[PDB]
Design a protein around this nucleic acid. Sequence first.
DNA 1: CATTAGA
DNA 2: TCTAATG
Length: 327
Amino acid sequence: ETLNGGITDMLTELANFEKNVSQAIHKYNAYRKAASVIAKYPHKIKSGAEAKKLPGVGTKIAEKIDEFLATGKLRKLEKIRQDDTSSSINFLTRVSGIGPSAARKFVDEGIKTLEDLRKNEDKLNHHQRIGLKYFGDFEKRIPREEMLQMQDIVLNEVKKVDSEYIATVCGSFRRGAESSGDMDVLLTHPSFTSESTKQPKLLHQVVEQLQKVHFITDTLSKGETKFMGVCQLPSKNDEKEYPHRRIDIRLIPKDQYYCGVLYFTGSDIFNKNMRAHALEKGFTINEYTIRPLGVTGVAGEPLPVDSEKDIFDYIQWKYREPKDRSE
DNA sequence: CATTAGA
DNA sequence: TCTAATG
Ligand code: NA
Ligand code: NA
């Protein structure tokens, strides 16, 4: 967690550089584990060989290690830090719809600046275009203050169309969190579950609604289960407009909300940690279900949930507020 | 890791 | 189809 700081840190640098700049999945994959072992490692690593002794830690890494152990730097790390070509990529990627593969190509054609992108708005697809459009706005964090207005508004339509709907903004916003990235409203409806072969309009109905009232302004992808778009709080009585937000809404089988619901509300840990709990409490939890564990190794038979409650009740926990889903 | 664009 | 990007 700290003793191994600089090592682990450089390692991930390196690592990331591989994947991104180069199409070096192996190396890339290499550093990570390397980076991973030593993290877990209990002592203050002192040198190449010292590391060396570990699974994953080979010669290559080791070497770089010492030099780092020697100079508070590393070369390759430095060069890459320098190289526009590589820095160029790390930049492009910031655009929704822009990835490494694109970032690289985009570069070879020479696009390297956000401005470059404008100039070749055509060379980009509706995603990235939208990605590019609201570029500034996407980087900004979401105020909880805002978070609720929005929240309010969304629920406002959901119910409006049909009362039978149930939608939930999951995440951090949900964990009391001061700010969010993008909001996630986990959708579902009674008439829809594990079997009742869809009702696509189920989604479509909503999306439409929000578009109607002007909350969603753009679509990034509408599927018949997941939608990804961009929204905005009606910019009040002139003088101050809202930034453009990323939103995501998804349909769910009322027979898996809570589950899927427990899950997204995390935290990323509370989950592993809650997930870690059900294993010993004779269960299994994953994004949609709770399965009673059978001694053969595995088992099946997904247990019937009506609130975030049952799950705790099942594996037998203390119901914990979203507030307290901290770790 | 599953869902949507694309091409 | 496959592959990329998002989550
Ligand atoms: Na070793
Ligand atoms: Na991106």
